[PDB]
């Protein structure tokens, strides 16, 4: 039953993902390779992160044909199945740490606008991707934890003894999924909260990175931890063991869709790159006092409205747009001067001029602003 379903789902789902990866990941490789020509300090490191992710996923892409050919036969060649599993593991963990470092970079650029000048550098990016390659391959090196001879003889590679002991399961799982998952969650939540405080493309790309990370890594690592909790310190129960084996095998056959799921972060990063409540309520009060100036008779009322409008303009100026807000504050200043002089109708004329200045220079902001922030 479980074996028949295994064979059916494997033969059905490995066929498309190979072509999908070899097409879309290669397209991403080419696109970001052309994008690195721009050579800006902050506009390049992300492209090196993307090319690292694309290479890590292309590893799995090239592994898929080998895993298919070595599994469609009754284990004729047992040496290369270990290589296939090593490729899969290096792919997953390199992808995890690459996307997690991307989230670190985005969070440190958002929360600390000054440190990104000295942090985000193409040399730093090349160094960190090379470093993560080295450590991930070094941690994939000790996969020969079984008996020295014979070696494991199945491509789903359950393995035994010290593999599922705390000496191996924890130092791998905590340092490869749990810590990246936790720190990515913190970074992404803080980034989204800050961006929503400043309020779309950036929110979209952080959300896409977090969603891709969760969907592609949480199931397989949850299955790993569940097997550790079940086959070590929980009764077999037969039914639970069968269900958990089914779940972990499915996550094995569904985590290979990561090479395609990475397109959801690639596309949004590319859209953000092509394109390049605080602001919303600043615009709201600008319009509100602009409209209440018209229905006013006391000079004190128009003075108060102009004061609030000037405060809003000054606050929003810190988020072309520099000069537009400059002339907006200037016109608010003439309106305030006229109101202080005692004239009210002249304040209305100044407010009308302020309205046309806003419609001309300001409306481009709060429109592009609600497309990146």
């Amino acid at each position, epitope marked *: 039953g479980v074996n028949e379903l295994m064979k059916t789902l494997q033969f059905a789902v490995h066929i498309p993902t190979f072509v999908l990866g070899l097409l879309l990941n290669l397209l991403a490789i080419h696109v970001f390779s052309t994008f690195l020509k721009n050579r800006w300090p902050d506009y390049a490191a992300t492209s090196i992160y993307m090319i690292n992710l694309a290479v890590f996923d292309l590893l799995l892409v090239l592994s898929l044909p080998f895993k298919m050919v070595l599994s469609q036969v009754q284990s004729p060649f047992p040496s290369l199945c270990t290589l296939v599993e090593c490729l899969y593991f290096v792919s997953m963990y390199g992808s995890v740490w690459t996307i997690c470092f991307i989230s670190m970079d985005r969070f440190l650029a958002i929360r600390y606008p000054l440190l990104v000048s000295h942090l985000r550098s193409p040399r730093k990016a090349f160094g960190i991707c090379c470093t993560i390659w080295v450590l991930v391959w070094t941690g994939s090196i000790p996969i020969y934890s079984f008996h020295g001879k014979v070696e494991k003889y199945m491509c789903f590679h359950n393995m035994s003894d010290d593999t599922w002991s705390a000496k191996v399961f924890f130092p791998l799982e905590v340092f490869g999924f749990l810590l990246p998952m936790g720190i990515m969650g913190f970074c992404c939540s803080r980034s989204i909260h800050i961006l929503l405080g400043r309020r779309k493309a950036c929110i979209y790309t952080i959300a896409a990175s977090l969603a891709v990370f969760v969907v592609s890594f949480l199931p397989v690592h949850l299955g790993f931890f569940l097997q550790f909790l079940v086959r070590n310190s929980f009764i077999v129960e037969c039914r639970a063991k069968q269900s958990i084996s089914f779940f972990l095998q499915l996550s094995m056959c569904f985590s290979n869709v990561n090479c395609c799921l990475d397109v959801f972060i690639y596309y949004f990063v590319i859209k953000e790159f092509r394109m390049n409540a605080d602001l919303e309520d600043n615009w709201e009060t600008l319009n509100d006092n602009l409209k209440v100036i018209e229905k006013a008779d006391n000079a004190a009322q128009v003075k108060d409205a102009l*004061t*609030k409008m000037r405060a*809003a303009a*000054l606050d929003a100026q*810190k988020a072309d747009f520099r000069h537009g807000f400059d002339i907006l504050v200037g016109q608010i*200043d003439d309106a*305030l001067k006229l109101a*202080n002089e005692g004239k009210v109708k002249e304040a209305q004329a100044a407010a009308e001029q302020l309205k046309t200045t806003r419609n001309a220079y300001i409306q481009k902001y709060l429109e592009r602003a609600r497309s990146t922030l």
Partner: antibody, heavy 124, light 109 residues
Framework: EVQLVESGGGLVQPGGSLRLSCAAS????????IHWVRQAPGKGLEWVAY????????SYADSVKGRFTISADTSKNTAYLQMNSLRAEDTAVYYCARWGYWPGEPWWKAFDYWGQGTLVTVSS | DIQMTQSPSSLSASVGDRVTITCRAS??????VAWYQQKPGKAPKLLIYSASSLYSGVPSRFSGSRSGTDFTLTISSLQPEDFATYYC??????????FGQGTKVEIKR
């Protein structure tokens, strides 16, 4: 360097008149806004008036409006605040301060270069 | 009309502690806050123009920060020459400039 020297303050009977002339050296009164800030003895700082010779805009605080008239002659690069209808609550040390125009850094530096003060004392 | 109230009316500290003076505005002023230091019998001097910008000519011990409508001044490294009255000013517009009540920093003993 830029300096603001204020002179004129002294003994004035209640209801009298006095004219404090803060003189600007190092810049022009037409490129900066001159404000008057007064400090009652042992009390805090209170804004008095404001003059902008470039635009002719004059403003006064609520507790002073209608009595003192601020003026500035750009030929002499000096600003004059004219005491009128004085009362005992008006005795203080008067500070003439400069303030840049919009836009840019000069406006954001609110009162970078103050004066030296002139003790105006009023009582019968 | 834009009232500015600073909580510590008189704060006592020794030479070498962290001094925090907090200011609150009645209504929103974006960054139009300036901190002035007044030694007795002398004109005030600018310390922190804008919300956090540091004026050129005063030691880097003075720092400012903005939390919405709340403004704070930090003198984290005190010195025998930082004992004076510190004022909080809002300068949203020329005719609406208002000052705080002051904060006299004395010597703890």
């Amino acid at each position: 360097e830029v300096q603001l020297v204020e002179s004129g303050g002294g003994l004035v009977q209640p209801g009298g008149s006095l004219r404090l002339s803060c003189a600007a050296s190092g810049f022009n009164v037409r490129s900066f806004s001159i404000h008057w800030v007064r400090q009652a003895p042992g009390k805090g700082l209170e804004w008095v008036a404001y003059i902008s010779s470039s635009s002719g805009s004059t403003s006064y605080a609520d507790s002073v409006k209608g009595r003192f008239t601020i003026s500035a002659d750009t030929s002499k690069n000096t600003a004059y605040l004219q005491m009128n209808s004085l009362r005992a609550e008006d005795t203080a040390v008067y500070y003439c301060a400069r303030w840049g125009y919009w836009p840019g850094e000069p406006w954001w530096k609110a009162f970078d270069y103050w004066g030296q003060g002139t003790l105006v004392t009023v009582s019968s | 009309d834009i009232q500015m109230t600073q909580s510590p009316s008189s704060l006592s500290a020794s030479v070498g502690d962290r001094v925090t003076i907090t200011c609150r505005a009645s209504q929103s002023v974006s960054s139009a806050v300036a901190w002035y230091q007044q030694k007795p019998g002398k004109a005030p001097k600018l310390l922190i123009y804008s919300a956090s910008s540091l004026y050129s000519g005063v030691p880097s011990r003075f720092s400012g920060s903005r939390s919405g409508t709340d403004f704070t001044l930090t003198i984290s490294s005190l010195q025998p020459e930082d004992f004076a009255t510190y004022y909080c000013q809002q300068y949203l517009y020329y005719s609406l400039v208002t000052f705080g009540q002051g904060t006299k920093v004395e010597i703890k003993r």
